[PDB]
Design a protein around this nucleic acid. Structure first.
Lengths: 66, 66
DNA sequence: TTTTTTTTTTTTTT
C-alpha cells in the first residue's frame, strides 16, 4: 500500500522477507520510464512507527514554535 | 528538538537555512566518538508531515492487513 | 560511508 505525501514522496507499507516495513520515501523516474525508490528515505519497523506516532504531539509542538 | 523513536533513530525538528524541516533519520557513532546523522533518513517539509499525519489511519490499516 | 524542501537512487537495533 502506498500513501502519497508529496509530489514524489510516499509512505509505503510492505512485507519484506517476513517483516512489515513502513517506508517514508522519495521516489524517482528512471531512464526506462519506471518509478523507483530513491536514496532519500527510511524504512521503519512497527515499534519505531509506534514510537513516532506516540511523539506526534511533541513533534507538532516543536514545529508550531518555530 | 529531538524525539527518539528507536535505539539510533530520531525525529528532529529544526530551522535549516530559513526552512522548517521534520527529519526522520538513523544516526551513527563516528570514529571520533560523536553522534552523526546517517544516510538513512528523509527531511520532510511541514506540508509533507501534515499529509503523513492525515494518513496514519490508512497506514495503520495497511499494516494490519499485510 | 553516513542530513538538511516540490540523476546515477530500497528493503528493521531502545
Amino acid at each position: 500500500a502506498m500513501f502519497q505525501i508529496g509530489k514524489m514522496r510516499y509512505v509505503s507499507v510492505r512485507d519484506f522477507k517476513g517483516k512489515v516495513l513502513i517506508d517514508i520515501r522519495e521516489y524517482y523516474m528512471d531512464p526506462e520510464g519506471e518509478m523507483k525508490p530513491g536514496r532519500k528515505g527510511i524504512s521503519l519497523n512497527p515499534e519505531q512507527w509506534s514510537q513516532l506516532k506516540e511523539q506526534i504531539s511533541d513533534i507538532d509542538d516543536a514545529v508550531r514554535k518555530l
